[PDB]
Amino acid sequence: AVKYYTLEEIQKHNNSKSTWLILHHKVYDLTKFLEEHPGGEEVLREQAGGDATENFEDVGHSTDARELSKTFIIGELHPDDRSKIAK
Ligand code: HEM
Ligand SMILES: [Ca+2]
Ligand SMILES: [Ca+2]
Protein backbone atom coordinates (compact mmCIF):
# COMPACT_ATOMS: atom_id res chain seq x y z
CA ALA A 1 0.00 0.00 0.00
CA VAL A 2 3.04 2.16 -0.76
CA LYS A 3 1.94 5.20 -2.95
CA TYR A 4 4.44 5.56 -5.76
CA TYR A 5 5.42 8.68 -7.68
CA THR A 6 7.55 8.58 -10.79
CA LEU A 7 10.74 10.64 -11.06
CA GLU A 8 9.09 12.31 -14.06
CA GLU A 9 6.23 13.45 -11.69
CA ILE A 10 8.51 14.39 -8.75
CA GLN A 11 10.55 16.65 -11.02
CA LYS A 12 7.48 18.80 -11.49
CA HIS A 13 7.25 19.63 -7.78
CA ASN A 14 10.06 22.12 -7.92
CA ASN A 15 8.61 25.48 -6.95
CA SER A 16 7.19 27.53 -4.09
CA LYS A 17 3.79 26.12 -4.60
CA SER A 18 4.90 22.45 -4.33
CA THR A 19 8.42 21.33 -3.37
CA TRP A 20 9.18 17.62 -3.11
CA LEU A 21 12.43 15.84 -2.78
CA ILE A 22 13.54 12.21 -2.52
CA LEU A 23 15.53 10.72 0.41
CA HIS A 24 16.35 7.00 0.38
CA HIS A 25 13.60 6.19 -2.15
CA LYS A 26 10.88 8.00 -0.27
CA VAL A 27 9.18 11.21 -1.33
CA TYR A 28 8.91 14.15 1.00
CA ASP A 29 6.63 17.19 0.60
CA LEU A 30 8.69 20.01 2.08
CA THR A 31 6.62 22.90 0.63
CA LYS A 32 5.69 24.21 4.02
CA PHE A 33 8.73 22.77 6.00
CA LEU A 34 11.27 24.69 4.10
CA GLU A 35 9.98 27.90 5.86
CA GLU A 36 11.04 26.23 9.24
CA HIS A 37 14.04 24.22 8.34
CA PRO A 38 17.02 25.11 10.60
CA GLY A 39 19.41 24.76 7.68
CA GLY A 40 17.54 27.45 5.75
CA GLU A 41 15.37 27.47 2.68
CA GLU A 42 17.77 27.54 -0.22
CA VAL A 43 19.49 24.21 0.43
CA LEU A 44 16.14 22.57 0.17
CA ARG A 45 14.97 24.62 -2.86
CA GLU A 46 18.23 23.59 -4.64
CA GLN A 47 17.18 19.98 -4.29
CA ALA A 48 13.51 20.37 -5.20
CA GLY A 49 12.30 17.87 -7.74
CA GLY A 50 15.04 15.34 -7.17
CA ASP A 51 17.09 13.18 -4.87
CA ALA A 52 18.82 14.76 -1.90
CA THR A 53 19.90 11.61 -0.07
CA GLU A 54 23.55 12.40 -0.22
CA ASN A 55 23.13 15.93 1.06
CA PHE A 56 20.90 14.82 3.93
CA GLU A 57 23.57 12.29 5.31
CA ASP A 58 26.49 14.41 4.64
CA VAL A 59 25.11 17.13 6.93
CA GLY A 60 24.89 14.84 9.89
CA HIS A 61 21.22 15.30 10.69
CA SER A 62 20.30 14.37 14.21
CA THR A 63 18.07 11.49 15.08
CA ASP A 64 15.56 14.16 16.04
CA ALA A 65 15.73 15.54 12.52
CA ARG A 66 15.28 12.03 10.96
CA GLU A 67 12.28 11.54 13.15
CA LEU A 68 10.84 14.81 12.09
CA SER A 69 11.47 14.01 8.40
CA LYS A 70 9.12 11.07 8.52
CA THR A 71 6.19 13.40 9.02
CA PHE A 72 6.64 14.74 5.48
CA ILE A 73 6.62 11.42 3.63
CA ILE A 74 3.91 11.30 0.99
CA GLY A 75 4.99 8.17 -0.91
CA GLU A 76 7.95 6.48 -2.49
CA LEU A 77 9.85 6.56 -5.76
CA HIS A 78 8.31 4.36 -8.43
CA PRO A 79 10.08 1.07 -8.80
CA ASP A 80 10.90 1.86 -12.49
CA ASP A 81 13.20 4.70 -11.31
CA ARG A 82 15.09 2.83 -8.60
CA SER A 83 18.18 2.08 -10.63
CA LYS A 84 18.44 5.66 -11.87
CA ILE A 85 18.06 7.09 -8.39
CA ALA A 86 19.75 4.71 -5.53
CA LYS A 87 18.80 4.33 -2.42
C1 HEM B 1 12.79 16.38 5.54
C2 HEM B 1 14.03 16.47 5.63
C3 HEM B 1 14.78 17.38 6.58
C4 HEM B 1 14.52 17.69 7.85
C5 HEM B 1 13.38 17.23 8.71
C6 HEM B 1 15.60 18.51 8.33
C7 HEM B 1 15.74 18.96 9.60
C8 HEM B 1 16.85 19.69 10.08
C9 HEM B 1 16.98 20.04 11.48
C10 HEM B 1 15.99 19.77 12.54
C11 HEM B 1 18.21 20.62 11.58
C12 HEM B 1 18.93 21.06 12.83
C13 HEM B 1 20.11 20.15 13.16
C14 HEM B 1 19.82 18.70 13.34
O1 HEM B 1 18.77 18.36 13.93
O2 HEM B 1 20.65 17.89 12.89
C15 HEM B 1 18.76 20.70 10.25
C16 HEM B 1 19.91 21.36 9.89
C17 HEM B 1 20.44 21.46 8.62
N1 HEM B 1 19.90 20.82 7.49
FE1 HEM B 1 18.23 19.77 7.40
N2 HEM B 1 16.53 18.73 7.31
C18 HEM B 1 16.02 18.04 6.23
C19 HEM B 1 16.63 17.97 5.00
C20 HEM B 1 17.82 18.58 4.67
C21 HEM B 1 18.43 18.49 3.37
C22 HEM B 1 17.89 17.57 2.24
C23 HEM B 1 19.54 19.29 3.39
C24 HEM B 1 20.50 19.61 2.31
C25 HEM B 1 20.11 19.66 1.03
C26 HEM B 1 19.61 19.83 4.72
C27 HEM B 1 20.61 20.70 5.18
C28 HEM B 1 20.75 21.15 6.48
C29 HEM B 1 21.80 22.03 6.93
C30 HEM B 1 22.87 22.61 6.07
C31 HEM B 1 21.59 22.24 8.27
C32 HEM B 1 22.38 23.16 9.15
C33 HEM B 1 23.66 22.58 9.75
C34 HEM B 1 23.47 21.57 10.86
O3 HEM B 1 22.63 21.82 11.74
O4 HEM B 1 24.22 20.56 10.87
N3 HEM B 1 18.57 19.42 5.48
N4 HEM B 1 17.88 20.09 9.36
CA1 LIG C 1 10.88 31.19 8.49
CA1 LIG D 1 10.38 31.88 2.54
Residue numbers in the entry: 8 to 94
How does the study describe this entry?
Unrestrained refinement was also applied to the 6-propionate group in the oxidized form 1 structure. The C—O1 [1.253 (9) Å] and C—O2 [1.246 (10) Å] distances are consistent with the results for the 7-propionate group. The interactions with Arg89* and other interactions with the neighbouring molecules in the crystal fix the structure from Phe63 to His68, and small spaces exist between the adjacent molecules. In addition, water molecules were found near the main-chain atoms of Phe63 and His68 in the form 1 structures. The water molecules form hydrogen bonds to both the main-chain carbonyl of Phe63 and the main-chain amide of His68. The hydrogen-bond distances in the oxidized form 1 structure are shorter (0.2–0.4 Å) than those in the reduced form 1 structure.
In this work, we report the crystal structures of porcine b5 determined at sub-angstrom resolutions in both the oxidized and reduced forms. The comparison using high-resolution structures revealed that structural differences around the haem group may be important for regulating the electronic properties of the haem.
